[PDB]
Structure 1
Amino acid sequence: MEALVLVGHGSRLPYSKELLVKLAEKVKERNLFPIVEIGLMEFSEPTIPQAVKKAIEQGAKRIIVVPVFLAHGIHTTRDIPRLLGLIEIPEDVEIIYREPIGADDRIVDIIIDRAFGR
């Protein structure tokens, strides 16, 4: 009844989409969610609406959208809330737009390990 939609920027390069896909897989391996889909905002497929529709077609009534972005930007405050009709497609269900990653202590952990070539 719950779906998690991971949402990302998307580049013309494939790294960004690879990143989303690997992330989705790892959350699948954690078995917390019935439905788990990804969506990219620009120049990639599947797109955010495609992902939301795909979640709904699988019968999800609460769609948790997580913006996989470090910080808030135009994308997280305008475009995505727009694409989800949260501002200014979906019937019956409620979309739950979550927060970005932000300056989480676990990121400073990752940054340090990254600094040391680890």
Structure 2
Amino acid sequence: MEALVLVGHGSRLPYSKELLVKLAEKVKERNLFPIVEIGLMEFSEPTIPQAVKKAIEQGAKRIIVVPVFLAHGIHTTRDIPRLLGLIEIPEDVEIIYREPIGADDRIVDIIIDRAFGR
């Protein structure tokens, strides 16, 4: 009934899509969402519209879109809301555009681990 769509920037190197794929597999492992799809803004496939369509066609009517980005900017405030036509979705279907990662204490934790090469 609802789907998680994880959305990422995309890269000409493979690292970005690998990351979204690992994140989606990890979230799949927690069994919270019936459907979990990934989309990339530029360069790679699947694209954000493709991810959304895949979710709809598995029978979701509430699409939770989470931008896997550190901060807001052009991509999160313009391009993505655009691609989601929030500015090809049925009536019976709502897109719920969520919030990026931001300055979360857990990323402070992650940064200190990285500082120490852990």
Q: TM bucket by the smaller chain?
A: over 0.9
Moved more, 101-110 or 86-95: 86-95
Alpha-carbon deviation of 1:92? Answer: 2.2
Structure 2 regions of 5+ residues with no counterpart? none
User: Bigger CA drift: 91-100 or 9-18?
Assistant: 91-100
Give deviations 1:72-118, integer Å, cap 9, x for gaps.
Answer: 01000000000001019444200000000000000000000000000
**Partners in 2 of 1:69 and 1:44 — Cα distance?**
16
Cα distance in 2 for partners of 1:100, 1:91 equals 26
8 Å CA contact retained: 1:82, 1:88: no
Deviations 1:27-64 (A, max 9, x none): 00000000000000001000000000000000001000
- Structure 1 CA distance for aligned equivalents of residues 75 and 90 of structure 2: 20
Give the root-mean-square deviation of aligned CA atoms.
1.4
Q: Single out whichever of 69-78 and 88-97 deviates more from structure 2.
A: 88-97
CA distance in 2 between counterparts of 1:92 and 1:86 reads 15
Using the size of structure 1 for normalisation, the TM-score is 0.97
Q: Aligned with 1:7: secondary structure?
A: strand
Change in CA separation of 1:52 and 1:88 when aligned onto 2, cut-off 3 Å = closer
Q: How far apart, in 1, do the equivalents of 2:47 and 2:90 lie?
A: 15
Structure 1 Cα separation of the partners of residues 91 and 74 of structure 2: 26
User: What TM-score does the superposition give when structure 2 sets the normalisation length?
Assistant: 0.97
Paired residue total: 118
Residues 24 and 36, structure 1, Cα contact 8 Å, conserved in 2: yes
Q: Which runs of 5+ in 1 are unaligned?
A: none
Q: Given that residues 7 and 68 in structure 1 are in contact (C-alpha distance below 8 angstroms), is that contact kept between their aligned partners in structure 2? A: yes
Q: What percent of counterpart residues are identical?
A: 100
Q: 1:55 to 1:88 in 2, by over 3 A?
A: closer
Would the alpha carbon gap of residues 24 and 10 (structure 1) be closer, same or farther in structure 2, given more than 3 Å must change? same
